[PDB]
């Protein structure tokens, strides 16, 4: 993006001042759309010395004579040339600037425009910058951030000591990673993305995307009228144990609710009987085990079962002990079908197996599972899209790293999912998503496409729950999937 | 305004390119507000070589990659520097320009953006300019004009041989006289006025204004609860004759419907009896005349009657003969009250009388009456605001020159009224407005203020008629005045 500004100025010939004018007026229009008529509000515009501040001077200048009061607090030392030009315009237009900030200054204003730092933030915020941000955060005023809330690193979404909490953020061209990943996603408040005149070619060249409704709509598989269940594929789910009898049921129904033609579960006897007593549409094959867990004794039956399917999901509720490790790794090594690898199958996975497989795989860890898989801490892997990309690329797989914002990558293309709510922060949620992904693969979507559509729909179904999200359970999530699908179309 | 551009660039320091970018994007936003989503439309942008054309190149460039198709036909020879800069951007952005116009070119486009000539039009349009404008006018496409429809003189509203008929015109800063006066008012279609970043001080310095609802609302006189009829003034209307018995009634009720406390008519007997049989609230004094017309015999009674009033309206239906001329001129010469002078009192007026009066006057001619009053042709006076201003200034009066756009001036301040419709193009309409103006003067508004409020409300009342406007009559107009008043508040 600063690349995209650079090219638009130096190669396309757009004056930097024209980009900055367009940025500032976008902020004014955005605020009007959110607050209604601006003429009754008093504005405090906080401007740094850089281009974000310059954008702020444009805002301030365009509000002059049209709103109740505007004051700029200039917080920088030096001014970049465009900031200086726009400062000069603000003052020529009769605008007032002060350079000292007084704690009681918030009292006489209704709206704070935060133009302190944009994408040029380097290092922790301290001093008067911090004191001022902390005062704005305690003020209860309406806060509109220019580009990114000051204090958010726009590459990672991390807070650099302290950051503005905005009601509205207006960003330019494309959303930044810092609006998409937490905590930055939370501090952004409502995000508007403004067109400030970059060539469309440069906007579309970005390689990291937010999954949108239109993207998912266009990926949904067709349902030709002259069809039968075989048209819509077959899934095998290898799942469950004497300890975890529920997981298979949720995965299997996740596949059926997204349109899959046939779903077979392989589950240890008698736990397999649990699935059909709840959903008799499922096929739940009884696997005879020594002690209630899959082991190498079951390798051959599972491979036979896999021959008549298009995709295999493995892992939910398997347990994690040595015989399961041996089974999972020997199975995946021999299986010549796409695999969706989740939960306990991740916890015992030998990643060498993934390198040697000719067939594709999708892995769906939460950060605790990812952390154990790459031998790092949760803090080092959480929202670490570059680590996810490296892992996907090295192991020839799709990685779906689950969290409130989910990252979906094959190492070349990375997508971010922002649907969902905290009702998914509960056992069983993950098991449903596993079945969904397998189901869409069976219907003919690529592993990456299936993962993209599934994470979106899974989160969207959650948002459709009619009561308080904390009461959402996986069973109700399932009931909501076909409504998410209908609403998407 | 080109003055206002000049000052904003040279004194305030706004780059001309920034004004031109802001102009162009205003056009795009305006079109979206009127057409909805632009992405399904194909745009033909016709660009002259001047700043209007430059504005067009901005439009074209901002539509690239976002709509179905854009093509620019460049119709000029040379390009001004800002036009050249924006042409260069359009092409760097991948935009297509042709310099030849082919009659069938309209066929592949839905919307024509007319950026040929703005306020820099000099002289009659001919050649390929004309041929192209005539083709656009026959095309049935949606036409959006940049600044002013090409071919309208923005100072007068006259068509310079041929002009674009627009569905939408987007102008910058303030409306131009050519959007307000006909024929230009008709060719403008719907007018949007965009803020392109001129300092508010310069926008407000314009001395010619369109009368707006907010202006009229703020001028309406107060109605204190502890009041009585004397609070709201007294009007004398000297009007009518044996030939024209209806005029007094319409003038008198026009005064009462705007809130005047007391209205007295002086009308030749027995024609005075007409008024009270229709509206018994009126006082209609019988004037004993020799042959059914006011003459010098009635001078003294009329002056006595005028002593107990705040304003006198004279002229509707008086007739125009020598004895009426003598009476009107001797009356106005001696009357030390504000006078509203209409219709036949204008046709016999000696303008020397107006110069010698110490008291104020409002004159309300239509162009035929104005033409006879200054000894010019109707064509030379119609919509001639500079002539109206000169006349007001020389004769120390307010001139209200009636037409579909009415001009109201005291020689220093000029206002334009754009309310009304063709139902007012009928005998009796003028008589009502006369009473309205007198009524508001009696309530304490200045002659100019009274005229401003009255022309607006008179036209607005017409637009409130519930059936086809051609069926509107003055009597129904009267019934509608109090609803116009209510709606204004």
């Amino acid at each position: 993006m600063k690349e995209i500004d650079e090219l638009t100025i130096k190669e396309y010939g757009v004056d930097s001042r024209i980009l900055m004018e367009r940025a500032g007026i976008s902020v004014v229009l955005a605020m009007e759309e959110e607050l209604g008529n601006l003429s009754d509000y008093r504005f405090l515009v906080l401007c740094g010395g850089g281009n974000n501040g310059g954008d702020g001077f444009v805002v301030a200048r365009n509000l002059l004579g049209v709103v109740k009061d505007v004051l700029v607090v200039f917080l920088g030392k030096k001014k970049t040339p465009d900031c200086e030009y726009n400062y000069g315009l603000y003052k020529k237009f009769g605008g007032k600037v002060v350079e000292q900030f007084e704690p009681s200054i918030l009292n006489e204003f209704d709206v704070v425009v935060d133009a302190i730092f944009g994408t040029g933030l380097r290092g922790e915020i301290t001093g008067e910058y911090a004191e001022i941000i902390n005062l704005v955060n305690k003020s209860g005023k309406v806060v509109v951030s220019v580009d990114v809330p000051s204090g958010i690193d726009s590459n990672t979404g991390k807070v650099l000591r302290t950051a503005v909490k905005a009601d509205l953020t207006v960003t330019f061209g494309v959303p930044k990673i810092g609006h998409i990943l937490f905590p930055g996603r939370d501090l952004t408040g409502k995000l508007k993305v403004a067109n400030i005149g970059h060539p469309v070619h440069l906007i579309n060249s970005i390689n990291r995307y937010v999954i949108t409704r239109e993207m998912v709509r266009s990926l949904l598989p067709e349902r030709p009228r002259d069809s039968h269940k075989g048209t819509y594929g077959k899934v095998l789910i290898i799942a469950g144990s004497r300890l975890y009898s529920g997981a298979p049921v949720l995965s299997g129904m996740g596949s059926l609710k997204v349109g899959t033609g046939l779903v077979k579960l392989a589950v240890p006897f008698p736990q397999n009987l649990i699935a059909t007593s709840r959903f008799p549409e499922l096929i739940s094959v009884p696997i005879d085990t020594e002690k209630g867990f899959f082991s190498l004794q079951n390798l051959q039956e599972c491979l036979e079962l896999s021959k008549d399917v298009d995709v295999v999901a493995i892992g939910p509720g398997l347990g994690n002990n040595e015989h399961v490790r041996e089974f999972v790794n020997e199975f995946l090594k021999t299986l010549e079908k796409p695999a969706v690898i989740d939960a306990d199958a991740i916890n015992v996975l030998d990643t060498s197996v993934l390198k040697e497989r000719k067939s594709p795989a999708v892995l769906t860890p939460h950060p605790g599972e990812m952390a154990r898989l790459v031998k790092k801490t949760v803090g080092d892997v959480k929202y670490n899209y570059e680590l996810a990309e490296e892992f996907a690329k090295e192991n020839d797989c799709v990685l779906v790293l689950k969290s409130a914002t989910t990252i979906v990558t094959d190492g070349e293309k990375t997508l971010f999912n922002i649907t969902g709510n905290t009702g998914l922060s509960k056992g069983g949620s993950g098991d449903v998503l596993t079945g969904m992904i397998a189901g869409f693969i069976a219907q003919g979507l690529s592993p990456l496409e299936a993962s993209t559509v599934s994470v979106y729909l899974h989160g969207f179904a959650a948002e459709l729950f009619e009561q308080d999200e904390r009461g959402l359970t996986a069973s109700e999530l399932l009931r909501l999937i076909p409504e998410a699908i209908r609403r998407l179309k | 305004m080109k003055e206002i551009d000049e000052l904003t660039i040279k004194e305030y320091g706004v780059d001309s390119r920034i004004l031109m970018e802001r102009a162009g994007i205003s056009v795009v936003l305006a079109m979206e507000e009127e057409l909805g989503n632009l992405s399904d439309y194909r745009f033909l942008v016709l660009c002259g070589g001047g700043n209007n054309g430059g504005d067009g190149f901005v439009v074209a460039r901002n539509l690239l990659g976002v709509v179905k198709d854009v093509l620019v036909v460049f119709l000029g020879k040379k390009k001004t520097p800002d036009c050249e800069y924006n042409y260069g951007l359009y092409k760097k952005f991948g935009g297509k320009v042709v310099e030849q116009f082919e009659p069938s070119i309209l066929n592949e486009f839905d919307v024509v953006v007319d950026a040929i000539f703005g306020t820099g039009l000099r002289g009659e349009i001919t050649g390929e300019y004309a041929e192209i404008i005539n083709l656009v006018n026959k095309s049935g496409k949606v036409v959006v004009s940049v600044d002013v429809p090409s071919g309208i003189d923005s100072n007068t509203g006259k068509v310079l041989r041929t002009a674009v008929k627009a569905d939408l015109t987007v102008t910058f800063g303030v409306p131009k006289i050519g959007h307000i006066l006909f024929p230009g008012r008709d060719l403008t279609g719907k007018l949007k006025v965009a803020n392109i970043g001129h300092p508010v001080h310069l926008i407000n310095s314009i001395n010619r204004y369109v009368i707006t609802r907010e202006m009229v609302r703020s001028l309406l006189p107060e109605r204190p609860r502890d009041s009585h009829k004397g609070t709201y003034g007294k009007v004398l209307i000297i009007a009518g004759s044996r030939l024209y018995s209806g005029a007094p009634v319409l003038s008198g009720m026009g005064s009462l419907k705007v809130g005047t406390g007391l209205v007295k008519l002086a009308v030749p007997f027995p024609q005075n009896l007409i008024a009270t049989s229709r509206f018994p609230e009126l006082i209609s004094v019988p004037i004993d005349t020799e042959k059914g017309f006011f003459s010098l015999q009635n001078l003294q009674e009329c002056l006595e009657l005028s002593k107990d009033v705040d304003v006198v309206a004279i002229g509707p239906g008086l007739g125009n003969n020598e004895h009426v001329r003598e009476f009107v001129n001797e009356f106005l010469k001696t009357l030390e009250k504000p006078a509203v002078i209409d219709a036949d009192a204008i046709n016999v007026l000696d303008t020397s009388v107006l110069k010698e009066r110490k008291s104020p006057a409002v004159l309300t001619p239509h162009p035929g009456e104005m033409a006879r009053l200054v000894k010019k042709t109707v064509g030379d006076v119609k919509y001639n605001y500079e002539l109206a201003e000169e006349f007001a200034k020389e004769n120390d009066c307010v001139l209200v020159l009636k037409s579909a756009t009415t001009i109201v001036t005291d020689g220093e301040k000029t206002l334009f009224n754009i309310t009304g419709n063709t139902g007012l193009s009928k005998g009796g309409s003028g008589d009502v407005l006369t009473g309205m103006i007198a009524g508001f003067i009696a309530q304490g508004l200045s002659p100019l203020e009274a005229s401003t409020v009255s022309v607006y409300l008179h036209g607005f009342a017409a637009e409130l008629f519930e059936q086809d406007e051609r069926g509107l009559t003055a009597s129904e107009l009267l019934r509608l005045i109090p609803e116009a008043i209510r709606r204004l508040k």
Partner: peptide
């Protein structure tokens, strides 16, 4: 809301 357009 009337920052941009008057009619």
């Amino acid at each position: 809301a009337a920052w941009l357009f008057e009619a």
